[PDB]
């Protein structure tokens, strides 16, 4: 049928990848030893998308992990469901980039990437014919940021006409770990503007935004964060696993939301994210939903919307409900929030029903935006990117290792027109 | 000896024609295997001992739709080579489901197409169903249409499209989807009817008053109106009409083709409680504006042709009475070159409720299909919205980069200008 | 073919209506449900398998009395779109009524009349029913007139209004509603009958023996008015009357058209079965004066014109009999220029008697509607009491800022006071 080849690069990229199987294998019903319980069709009829059969009954999610260093593969693999995975599938590195772009693309990661492409080539020529990818990692480190879109351009050369959906943490805006964002950063955004399908964007700042203010968790650690994502994450790719009244797949939701095709950057949402307090007392209904989708404070990218316009932006519903108020609350949005959508583009918002919520819930949503209120991050990280460039500073730990100085002028000069393409159309 | 082909291509086709093939069974009293425990000859085969299939091909690039068809209760009733399934959606692209993926899947239909046609010759004509805002409904519409009107010429080809309404969209590439697909639709069908989604919706808020419809109500009330068209063809009545009579009798110029629909009575047990249906009154709410289908007001257009299936209880007197109380009314319009504006139809047999749906058991029912100048409105809206959207060449990339070249966009525009001006020409 | 529009406006119309609703089934032997198990075409209509819709229309802008009938016993016998509700209330303004919110709604409501009112030609009148003191029964009750004189122009249109009571109020605006009102259904009303709220209570006080009846007990009294002024439509009778002919008999000039009301007998179980109920002596008591359902003396005015009908076994001769020892009596008299002065009609069906209500069943009754000039102190009162209230301008702001302008106070006034000045002249 259609498959989707999982990449999972850098640490970031492994451990929300970890609970991104969690959750998928709960949702499908498979137990940690990779057994089925739970006896209904649904959730076997569509397994193949992530799943390959063992001819032993077993089932072994198609997902390839790579990293530069051994410990934190390690720690996925001694967790819960880390006997899921193939052993096979773990690729290592032993010495590590240290948070370094030019050794994580250049110098450390080109000895592992012909070891790492012979295993992407081995489970994505294996079935019958291949829908897209998808690849989880960092843009503030050195092996998920270098090596992670080392793969995206080889891969894509590999398989030119074939999706390539990417879940790309940014830099935070305000306080930052790895105090080398900006170069990790611009370095990569302007060859993954040029290698990648779809790229939704996710921030740790909006997320530590969600925990406080919504959920209303005291602690809130790096498995919750995760979880988070994993839902939104879960939630793109409902209707390939499940039936539904109205149908979208990946490459459905990739001609409804890119007008010109420089501009592929998303802003994710998730609803409903109630407190256990406040689960007992809140209506879940169709226009409540909406209402909690279209909300600043549930985005988890940390970039106002409001002060941009929806260029075009999608919903996947999740659940039985009726298409109606599916579909006149998306009218409703648009004719009360005049200002905050595109003029030029009539009806911007597309909506699509899958029949099976996630487990607990009767009915959930997952939001895809289009805006042009990503270009505050763009602005924000050329910046500070260069603040840094100007001095010359921390450069000679890529110069030294066979990055030019061209190369950083034409990342900036490939950042600096994407800011002024979103400010074209605003 | 004589009989009908349909064809459901797309999610909304093949979603819409398992409701009208649920009705079907249940009209003719056939069990979802597909046996009963020759009337029923013009939809069903007769394969063996006294077992029928449809005569229906399901057609699309998604095999999450027709899977689920497959593994139903219905899995026995149609021929599995009948339910025909890609591998990869068209993903809302005319480019998509017309020039790449179109051509490995269109063989296998027209073999299928071949050799049910090859039956027993005599078959009145084809029924296809499909969405126009959609990518595999609009672009393998075009591409099927073109094979049958090259193999079949002097066929009948009636198409039933879900037309995109005026302010609910559910995508954003449907207004560049709308225009290259009547483009093709222009050509190579015969009689288009267009139906309109939030047009039922509204139906189903006055008069059965659901607030909340899924896609399976509006289904249902698309089967009644399938069904009452081809119930002279299945059973007698006293002034039956065919298929072929339809285009004689509705489209007066070759391109002037486009038609509505209304349905009358759809009341619920609440409301068939309290109505008298008498033939007067189902033709008064027939012809009432907000129990048209389309979501296009007839007050300011012309009735061109009028087409009145009236199905039950109906004595051929009450319909002459009504239709005059119709004429001498001031608050339509007709054309003045069509004197003679109606063609009324009767059959015997009243129109058949599915158990657990949600009309009411109704003695006798309209079915109105009606050719208006007031078309010029809904091809008028499109026409704008492609404007907008075409000004600064949005969404155009995923089109002309995956087939098809810059300037059919331009080609179907000025057909859809043609058409314009057409319409207007033909009402002063 | 020949039929009654029953029009209910504000909560007094709609409370009223309900009574005389219950009645006007179950007289004729209808259900709830609607359904009986064509002397009945007067109030109701067919719809299918013998089942029976009234043909009214129940319209306030406040939800919460409308909504109570909707979910009661008689949930379906109304039809659904007959019970109109607004969302706020009109909240004892006329201004609101007239104005700010009642525009809103009367579109809504000429909708439903005019398709009750086409079912057949020959639509005998309507029959409003509403408050003077309220708002918008007052405000949306005029506004209701103009459209209906400008459109069904030579139908005869009665009303019954549920004037203000000398003593008791409920209401402390409701002189300006009531001033404002009467200048308003001068000229959109053709005949109006006065019922006041303390003629009722002390009519059930000295004749029923109740001591402590609430609004229900007034309503079933003001419902056999109604019962009794259409019986002859209904039913067969000796000498009938249609509504056509009140008007003409009972109306001398254009802006004399307010009559008082009388019925009579109106005893309990314990009192009828003492009472002889001659035709004479139920005539007598109907025009006594403390029998009069106004609360207007008619001593100090002179009779204009007097209808009386008699509806159960009543011969013609005991008619004659009884009518002329009024005529000989001299503490009633009649004015010069009317010799005359009477209308008489009989009926056969006798007075049905509702379950569990408080009036016996009697063998017959009289109920007399008579124009006197005793009308000129019911306007009186009023007029003191408005000029009290306008002197020092008390409650103009909440008229004034809500959209009617200064003056119409003022033009109500010198019409009232020309009204004044003309049953004056009359009587000399």
Redesign the interface.
Known sequence: ??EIVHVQGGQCGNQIGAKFWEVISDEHGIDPTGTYCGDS?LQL??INVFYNEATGGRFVPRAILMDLEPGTMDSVRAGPFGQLFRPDNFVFGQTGAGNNWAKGHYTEGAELIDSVLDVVRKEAEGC??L?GFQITHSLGGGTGSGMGTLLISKVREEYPDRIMETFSVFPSPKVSDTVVEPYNATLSVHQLVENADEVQVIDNEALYDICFRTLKLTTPTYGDLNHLVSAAMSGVTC??RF?????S?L??L????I???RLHFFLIGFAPLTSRGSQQYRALSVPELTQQMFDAKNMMCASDPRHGRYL?ASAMFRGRM???????Q??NVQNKNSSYFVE?????M???VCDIPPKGLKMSVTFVGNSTAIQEMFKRVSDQFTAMFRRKAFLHWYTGEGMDEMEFTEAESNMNDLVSEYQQYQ | MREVISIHVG?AGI?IGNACWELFCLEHGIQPDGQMPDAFNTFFSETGAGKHVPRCVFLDL????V??VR?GTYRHLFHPEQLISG???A???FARGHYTIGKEIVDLSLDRIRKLADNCTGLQGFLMFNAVGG?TGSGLGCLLLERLSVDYGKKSKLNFCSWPSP?????????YNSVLSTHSLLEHTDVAVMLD??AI?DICRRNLDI?????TNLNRLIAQVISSLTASLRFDGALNVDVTEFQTNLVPYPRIHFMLSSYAPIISAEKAYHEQLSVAEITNSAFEPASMMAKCDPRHGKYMACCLMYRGDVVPKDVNAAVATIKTKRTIQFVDWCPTGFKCGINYQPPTVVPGGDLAKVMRAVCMISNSTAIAEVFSRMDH?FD??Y??R??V??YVGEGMEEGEFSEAREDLAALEKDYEEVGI
Request: aromatic content about 8%.
């Open positions: 049928m259609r069709d009829e569509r019958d014919c829908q209707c390939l039936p539904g009244q109205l149908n797949d490459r459905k990739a001609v409804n939301l007008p010109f095709p075009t009726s298409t109606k108020e599916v579909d006149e998306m009218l030029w583009i009539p009806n911007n597309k909506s699509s | 999610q979603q998604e095999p999450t739709v899977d689920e593994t591998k990869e959606d993903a809302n692209n990518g302010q609910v969209s559910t995508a954003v590439v449907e207004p989604n939030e919706y607030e909340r419809p899924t896609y919205k907008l959207m000004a600064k949005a969404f990339h995923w």
